[PDB]
Amino acid sequence: FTMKYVGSIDQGTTSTRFIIFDERQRPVSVHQVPHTQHTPHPGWLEHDPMEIFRSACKCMSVAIAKLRQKDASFRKIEAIGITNQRETTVAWDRVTKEPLCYAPVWNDLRTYDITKKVTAELGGGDSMFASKITGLPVSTYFAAFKMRWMLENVPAVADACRRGTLCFGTIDTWLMYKLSGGKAFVTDVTNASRTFLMDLRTRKWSPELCEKLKIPMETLPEIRSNSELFGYVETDECGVAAALNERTPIMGSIGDQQSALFGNMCFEKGEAKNTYGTGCFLLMNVGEEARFSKHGLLSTVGFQVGRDGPCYYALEGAIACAGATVEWMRRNMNLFSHITECEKLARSVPGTQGIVFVPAFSGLLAPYWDPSARGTIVGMTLKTTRAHVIRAALQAIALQLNDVVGSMKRDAGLNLSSLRVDGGLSKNGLLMEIQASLLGVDILVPSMHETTALGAALCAGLAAGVWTSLEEVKAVSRRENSWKTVSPSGSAMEREAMIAEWREALKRTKWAK
């Protein structure tokens, strides 16, 4: 009788937006609000959690209102899913319902000294002492250190903790907390797997990790799946409750990168997504047993649909950003003006004719690891032109992705089914070909590219009955938002020549000391 709509709040590193998705998985209304990136000292990043919570509410309320206008037939949101930046941590008080201090970003480096102290005191020297428990190396990224830090260097936080009134939260939790007026204090599994305090395999807070890091468990929220009731939105900031005009439940909460995996329909062992965002990540779905890395990839929770639903695990590798190289080529080097020029200039030549470009601008962080590596170009002749370099560029981007997928294949004990690209510089026709060829697989490019926000909408849609199964969901995608599939089309021969070059060229990149 009536159309169905599901809302996704997408809380990113530098902004927030609310996309309302159609029953046919169409983004039909959006609104973005940026938030200040506070940098008190070089290397520090903080976010005003109250600014963020107002952003979300505004985005929500503008977006609803816009639609009430261009679409009759839209009377309400069935359910709201939240997808958010991961490992930013928030500290707030059960009674004030106000944050104690700004929250440090996954980026933020303030935890450096706490990081080194843990590897030495608790790891015996070994940064990986807890990786079989968490899937994570000791690092400045993960929540628990940001938590330690705030208990260590913030008077309000330490007192609250001591008084018994402290809540630590990831952005999903903070958002569900405020959005619900304070009733909901919950976290989804993809997020909690980024705190350093969950047993990866059991998916419960680790008491042996909580006590060693003296993080009290009454400060932590209730771990839940990605899809199910988390609480209701009933707050009036910015008119939101009124806008919903209808008792809307939050039924979905999932980490961004994992949200991209999920909205790109990577439901099976083998499938992978490669997002280009503020960070660059490759996630591969490894199935129901958690696989652990040998080559410095993270082990994480892919997704989990329903409290007693199955939990699919993931390996995550941070690949260096493609756009970076294409940007520098253009901004710093003036190799092409700008725009589509990059692809046409690359397409305009057969191949690279001998040269390799390793864009190791800050070392190499793939399975190959060195910070001693610097951006290098080798094998140029007087015949070499900006055309070849820009190609070498694409090729090397494509090639880096392969080395990571290389490791991921080994640890996971499986072969890449396909790879989905999000369609950013993935607008790049040639890179797609270079990459599909190289990896031995169907590279997938979707026509509806709001895939991150979608992950969380699909999580909510499922919990609420907008869509009934991962089967139904994937049918609709193909019926409605037709993917474009790009086939491998090179020759086994050439593929190994491009890899040998690429490896022979990596033996040239060490310059830093």
Next chain:
Amino acid sequence: FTMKYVGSIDQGTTSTRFIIFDERQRPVSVHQVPHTQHTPHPGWLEHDPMEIFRSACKCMSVAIAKLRQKDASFRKIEAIGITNQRETTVAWDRVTKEPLCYAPVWNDLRTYDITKKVTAELGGGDSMFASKITGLPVSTYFAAFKMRWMLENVPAVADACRRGTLCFGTIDTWLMYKLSGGKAFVTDVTNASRTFLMDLRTRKWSPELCEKLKIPMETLPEIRSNSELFGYVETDECGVAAALNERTPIMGSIGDQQSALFGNMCFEKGEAKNTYGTGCFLLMNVGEEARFSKHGLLSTVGFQVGRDGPCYYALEGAIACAGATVEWMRRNMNLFSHITECEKLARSVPGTQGIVFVPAFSGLLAPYWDPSARGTIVGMTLKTTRAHVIRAALQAIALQLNDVVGSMKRDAGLNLSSLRVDGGLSKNGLLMEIQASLLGVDILVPSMHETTALGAALCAGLAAGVWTSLEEVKAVSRRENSWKTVSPSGSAMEREAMIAEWREALKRTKWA
């Protein structure tokens, strides 16, 4: 009495000019004529010798006419100097006074197979064998090899040999021959020294080597100095002797790079020159005694004024042409646009902030030869902009240089008393800084820049009594031609860092 003029014939790789000089060493008249660059197979290069001579003539003929018409006083040329591209070889019949075929040019790679045949059957594997005799390795460039190729590979050449009627010669010889109407048949010291057939020390045709490379000796011109009576212009061909209007004497003959040495007045041990043409070369006046380097540079004649005149010697090294590198950035990389910008952009930054660009596109030649080597750029960061690369290039060029002067200083046991320059790039002020800053020498810059042609003219003039001694020749230069001079600036340590950083990168150059 009034003005004395000496004409110079500059017969380059892609063209010939005739420049008429007054005794103030000033060009008062030029004409220039291109000639066809034949390429029968990829790698090969030929010149029609008849075309080179006709274009030699038309040049003389037109330049004279131009002066004649605009000054009523210019009536005669005192003498003619000839400066020419080295190593190109011509073969002509002694009686038809006509070529037996097109001339292999210096950098023509047809001789490859002949070159190897030699090295393994005359050095038994060592190609440096004839070093302390000719001064040179077994390369494709040098003349005796192009002689060998024609004798094995041109049925009409072997025919003229079997009649005793064949002549071989390099362009100076060929040009001198025809200009005489078949009467003079001479080469000169700097040009014979590139044939791979004369003993450097003695300036005589190695009988041993002629019979070794099976080249009969009565095919060879008479060796002479750079500065004497070679012959008289008697060809009435095209431009007449008439234009000359006085039988005129050929009194200066000297190879191109060597003419540039003489023309920028490097008559002292340690005095050197770096020039850019269709090839890039540096040489210095080592001194009266020949010297040699194990490092694989080349030892050759430098100049000899007169029959009984002194024979100063020279180390000469090939180098990566700067113009080529620069142009490459400009037209292959789009690194800039305006031949002017290369400069603005290097100054827009105060240094190369940790990148090295080794512009070994053909490979490392020079001191440490390696043709594995190719265009490397190392150690870029997200913060490296083309500003840096461009500078790094100019740094590279200067470093390639510095490195050639390591190998030349050592073997010669003397100091670089001054480096003379010219070529397109010596409008780049920064390069000149970075060259002096690194080389610890006054590098000087002619404002009268026609200094190759000038060297030939000077030789002819010296013989002719227009200028009377290498010393006067130079005094004259001082009065009338500003040399924009540049002197070194910086620490012995600021310097040591570029060379230090430079060496390590050349270990990354190896590719293929």
